[PDB]
A = this chain, B = another copy of it.
Amino acid sequence: VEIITHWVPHEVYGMPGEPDNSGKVFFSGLKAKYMGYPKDAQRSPYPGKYSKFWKTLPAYRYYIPDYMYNRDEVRPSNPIKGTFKLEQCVACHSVMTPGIVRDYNKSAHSKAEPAPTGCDTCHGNNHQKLTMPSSKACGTAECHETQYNEQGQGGIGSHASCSSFAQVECAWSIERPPGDTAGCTFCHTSPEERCSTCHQRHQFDPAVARRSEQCKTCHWGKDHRDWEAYDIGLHGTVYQVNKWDTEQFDFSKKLSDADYVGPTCQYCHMRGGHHNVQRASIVYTSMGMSMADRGAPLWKEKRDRWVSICDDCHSPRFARENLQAMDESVKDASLKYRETFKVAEDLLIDGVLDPMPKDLCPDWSGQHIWSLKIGAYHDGEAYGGTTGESGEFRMSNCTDVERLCFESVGYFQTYIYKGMAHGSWNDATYSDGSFGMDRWLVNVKQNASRARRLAALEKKVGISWQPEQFWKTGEWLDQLTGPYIVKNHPGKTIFDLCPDPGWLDTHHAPAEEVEYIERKLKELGITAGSH
């Protein structure tokens, strides 16, 4: 495989210094002058705390539509003028966008009486004042308030907050050029903002929404192998073998009446058809990066509920003990990471980390706080930042040791939790699970050893190592928020520049959750934690 520099007409070859947005071919993407995203392109600013630093693309308009499409100031132009009846929407679009009309005609919305839920009902009559319907539009009292409210019951890390918190206040997305993290906007906003999730537009078929694969489009990959774990496990094996056999899986049945041979994502997480997908969750553990013994007496009632779900096709004992095994795997995983972290932390404390945070490019905030610093556990001069303030947890713009630590807990550890939870034994072991963390521990130790050996040699020979320029600056690094803040707002951080209240300021844990924990801690006599 070569970087092919032939056949394609030369007239279209980009030469050094030429704009990257010219449309010319730059071999291996080299030598081009970075022009950045089109800031003249008609679009919407992102909502939320960090609106000012949120670089947006036109495409984003669809993804948080109430703010980014539906406001008069933002709504995009449309070449078709006039206000139309439903008949007219259908007739025109049946040819202009055939698939949409094909889908609509299949939908229950079209057949509804006395009046159908038509294109105009969801989009408006005036073609110059069209709107994109958010979850709020679907969730009106007259329509589907039930499902909206159900979903909205979710806490942090649920379908209720995956846009407003996770995405709108996403560090990396804000930090980087848009497009670097474009996929994050397209993935994160959907569950909260668009109800075409799971049951696709414009058919809105609950039968297709009941299929496991619906979840895979988001619940897969590097930091949550939810689909992969389920799919390859015996539940997923049973599923793939039987899913088109109507005698084994009847998707026409409502989830309350679901009598499948094996479970679906929906069978477990959307028990009874409840739209709060987090309803049965025990405790939020930051994607499984944070650790908890879910089998502990503290969570007895919550674990019991899970056993009630498995009860459908297993003895309580079998399920109880299998989930206990998961708990053990989770605990043993964090044992490994603690050892891994110690190696990394020691490099920082001994100041032999290559390089130290102060010699890296400033983080998204415009600070030189240690990547791995957790404000609740770490405090000191070496870590940086104010008391209680965390670092920008990342796999980018850091040392190999920092990166491998991130990968160990942020990727491999999650494969153990999700793997064991969904019955994928290999995901929890060989397939980048337990043995993934093992491999990375070795990698961290080796990197620590090398860095310490160099530091020792340089001391004795009397070299004071000057960290290289590429740790500080570079073509990509220069485009980040960090350097911009340091240069243009010298004394301040992004938090200073964005003083508005965040999601966490306005959204708290439900009263019943605090009430349960306090009751159980008193019942068992365990000390409460700190801020």
Contacts and interface: CB of A to CB of B under 8 A. Distances in A.
Given A32-B338, A98-B259, 5 more contacts: A27-B290, A27-B374, A59-B324, A396-B439, A453-B454
Nearest to A299: B23
Interface in A2-59: 2-16, 20-32, 34-35, 37, 57-59
A328 B182 contact: yes
Contacts of A294: 23
Contacts of A96: 311
Interface in A387-426: 390, 392-393, 395-400, 402-403, 407, 409-410, 413, 419-420, 424-426
Interface in A314-330: 314-315, 317-318, 321-322, 324-325, 327-330
A518 interface: yes
Interface stretch (A81-89, A139-147, A474-482, A492-500): A474-482
Contacts of A313: 97-100, 103
B457 A339 contact: no
A156 to B, nearest CB: 4
Contacts of A433: 183
Contact of A530 (B13, B283, B439, B465): B13
Contacts of A183: 329, 419-420, 424-429, 433-434
Contacts of A531: 10
Contacts of A424: 183
Interface stretch (A108-116, A173-181, A272-280): A173-181
Nearest to A20: B331
A168 interface: no
Contacts of A221: 232, 426-427, 430-431
Interface residues of A, number: 209
Nearest to A334: B29
B238 A200 contact: yes
Nearest to A187: B425
Given A11-B517, A222-B430, A438-B396, A296 B22 contact: yes
Contact of A441 (B178, B242, B396, B521): B396
A13 B376 contact: yes
Contacts of A29: 289-291, 333-334, 337-338, 409, 413
17 contacts: A1-B172, A3-B289, A7-B156, A9-B509, A9-B513, A9-B517, A23-B294, A27-B376, A183-B420, A183-B428, A183-B434, A211-B241, A213-B241, A338-B476, A354-B450, A441-B476, A449-B471
B403 A442 contact: yes
Contact of A468 (B15, B102, B338, B452): B452
Contacts of A187: 425-426
Which of A223, A375, A448 gathers most chain B CB within 10 Å? A223
A514 B11 contact: yes
A298 interface: yes
Which of A285, A395, A453, A477 gathers most chain B CB within 10 Å? A453
Contacts of A178: 328
A115 to B, nearest CB: 25
Nearest to A62: B318
Nearest to A236: B217
A138 interface: no
A341 interface: yes
Contacts of A450: 354, 450, 454
A287 interface: yes
A470 B342 contact: yes
Contacts of A1: 172, 223, 287, 393, 410
Interface string A371-394: 000111100000000000010110
Nearest to A388: B5
B339 A426 contact: no
Nearest to A234: B217
Contact of A283 (B8, B429, B452, B517): B8
